[PDB]
Design a protein around this ligand. Structure first.
Ligand code: 9PV
Ligand code: 9PV
Lengths: 413, 413
């Protein structure tokens, strides 16, 4: 795995910001794309764009074969058994809302529980809050251990015979924790519940095999895994999708439409109403080909190396707190003592470094952490240890800078 | 308006299919894109892709300014009063489903009516069938005149004081009829109902001014108007959106998230959950700049010329039926006597010509027309009368060809 040759494929990395080489450490907010994906979108619009299915003309057939070809690439990439289980959506958030509307609101009654965790992103909280309110069910939270991991004993305790859905992140976008999803799915299934996995932050960075995880649903976003914006996938086991009703209705997802009643197409098209995200899905297929050629296990190994390096170097800084466990995915969320993280991010961008500040769409977790906001640097296959050095040197300088302005200000008054 | 200079901007037009120059007459299924839009997507991914809002770093700020900049371009393009009324969605179909879920299912009771028309596309039928079933309301259809137009007297008769929603196409994707939306909105409003306008086939081809139409909601798709796939808009009057709940829930559309309850952001972001369709929406902004530079009234005038030319030349063909009115948008749906339209489309694609065959997502209309399927040639700003000549010459040849094989076959047996 040669990071020079990989970085050469991403045109956006090669520019300056504020007079310094760009150091992009915000891939958990969104990833950058390689020429193979951008040129796949260009070839689509320059050569074979047309609407898909009912192919009667040559371009239509090429676009349809491109779109359904990318569906098979996704199926193989997450090792689903069938294309019927792969639905294209606009992103993880819409995929999780479809499960909450079509599966939860059909299957919850008073007394039933949906169980989630305090580290969930909003997209894997709010649809369940609304689904339990619609149905009179109960929402419950699995508690976290002090390092931000989940114990399977707390899972066993929280999940009961009244639990119908457990919904949990594969990897946290704030703590970097990799949750024990395969063992959580066994506990859910032992209690008669399904498990819904939010895979937005695991899919780009490590191999996913839905048959080994035995998850009932799994959701992911293209824009975090070198693919186009505006596209995602919902995987669900075929026997559950077959019994769920559509979340949206219109052309392409019907078989017969009468004045008052309609019948639906087979899977997966039952869940894809209207003209689909044709270019984006073909571009996500190209992103998967690109990542597979590098190797997801190679990419996870490089991120293990960068995360171990970063946590060591952050422990060299005084006055910095990092949240979450030592064993983790490729990201570090932190705060500097006495500097607001938005000001940390502002000053780092003046040195060319892009990180994110705020609650990262996880307000209940920030409350658990007893902070109002954090800064996060996150890594992917095109980042290097030299970029981590630049980050830790800039945080040192930021600390000294805010120390010096404070000392100066205090002496002034 | 110079069609040579416009066609030079669309790289896809310049190729052969089956050894003949491509003649693309399927823009009502999807439009082709000019280099200005494809290069806007390339510049986004090559230079300033990042996630949007809470901008702390330079690329994030550029992408956010691009995305919200395209929102203002849309506002001005349809003459909405505020960006709060412009919501980005994945397409017309999702925009109409959001009104059916968030407005209709909140506002219908037994005895209330939703009124639509027999020429509606499925995307403006099925969400209302489901919304009235969910609520116990009643679905009613405005009947059509014999040429496939709607009389305002039938509108007045169908719409009653129990009607809460009238939903109607601006332009039919099969008949080419341009419906009298501004006068239908007055009739709806006089009865206490809102009007929902499906503008998928009008927006690409003629100026839209939502203040003059006085529509309460209006839905459109980027891919039909020279823009990227996977993106659309829902416009709704601000006072109606402010009272509607979100259709999907997650990050970006909240203000506060507690364990069990959340509060929503202001408009329009209340309706945009999760990472948005960043590249696609910036590319739809480029498509609008491109169309505005040509002039929507110029484009409508060129399509009036092509449609008048086509209807005259089709009346030169024996054994061909065209459906719908003489005054129409830029499309012609037809059948050849005794040839199935799928075989018409197959044979035309052997001469390089792309048209569409089937029910065009309007099965109740096909039943009204007493056919099971039709062929459709549809035009846009890059098509010419020479392409119509090629179409009518090929239909003549198709007719003779099927005549000759039949005569031959009959003599054989
Ligand atoms: C664990 C996890 N779950 C769901 C989401 C929502 O994904 P999206 O915004 O692509 O719909 C995300 C996206 N998180 C944001 C922006 S992707 C971030 O971490 O900056 C996520 O990380
Ligand atoms: C009048 C009208 N209403 C709604 C739609 C659905 O638009 P989309 O598929 O972009 O969600 C369409 C799209 N019609 C199809 C494919 S765009 C066609 O006519 O071939 C339409 O024409």
């Amino acid at each position: 795995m040669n990071i020079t040759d990989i970085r050469e494929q991403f045109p956006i990395l090669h520019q300056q910001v504020n007079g310094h080489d760009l150091v992009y450490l915000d891939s958990a907010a969104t990833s950058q794309k390689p020429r193979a994906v951008i040129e796949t979108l260009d070839k689509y619009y320059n050569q074979y764009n047309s609407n898909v299915h009912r192919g009667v003309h040559t371009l239509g057939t090429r676009a349809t074969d491109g779109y359904e070809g990318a569906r098979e690439k996704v199926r193989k990439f997450i090792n689903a058994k069938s294309m019927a289980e792969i639905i294209f959506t606009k992103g993880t958030t819409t995929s999780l809302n479809m499960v909450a509307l079509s599966y939860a609101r059909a299957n919850l009654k008073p007394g039933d529980e949906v169980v989630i965790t305090y580290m969930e992103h909003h997209a894997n909280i709010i649809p369940w809050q609304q689904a339990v309110k619609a149905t009179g069910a109960t929402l419950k939270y699995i508690p976290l251990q002090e390092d931000g991991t989940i114990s399977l004993e707390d899972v066993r305790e929280t999940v009961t015979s009244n639990t119908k859905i457990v919904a949990v992140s594969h990897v946290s976008n704030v703590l970097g924790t990799v949750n024990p999803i395969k063992e959580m799915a066994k506990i859910a299934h032992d209690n008669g519940a399904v498990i819904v996995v939010d895979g937005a932050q695991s899919t780009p960075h490590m191999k996913i095999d839905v048959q080994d995880l035995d998850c009932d649903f799994f959701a992911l976003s293209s824009h975090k895994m070198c693919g186009p914006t505006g596209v995602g996938v919902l995987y669900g086991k075929k026997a559950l999708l077959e019994n769920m009703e559509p979340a949206e209705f219109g052309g392409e997802m019907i078989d017969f439409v009468g004045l008052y009643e309609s019948t639906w197409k087979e899977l997966p098209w039952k869940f894809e109403a209207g003209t689909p995200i044709i270019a984006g899905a073909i571009g996500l297929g190209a992103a998967i080909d690109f990542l597979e050629e590098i190797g997801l296990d190679e990419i996870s190994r490089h991120e293990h190396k960068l995360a171990a390096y970063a946590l060591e170097r952050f422990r060299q800084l005084d006055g910095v707190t990092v949240y979450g466990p030592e064993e983790r995915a490729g990201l570090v969320t932190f705060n500097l003592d006495d500097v607001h993280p938005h000001d940390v991010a502002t000053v780092l961008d003046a040195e060319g470094i892009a990180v994110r500040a705020g609650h990262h769409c996880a307000q209940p977790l920030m409350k658990w952490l007893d902070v109002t906001a954090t800064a996060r640097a996150s890594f992917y296959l095109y980042n290097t240890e030299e970029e981590i050095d630049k980050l830790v040197e800039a945080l040192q300088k930021t600390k000294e800078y805010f120390t010096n302005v404070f000392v100066d200000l205090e002496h002034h008054h």
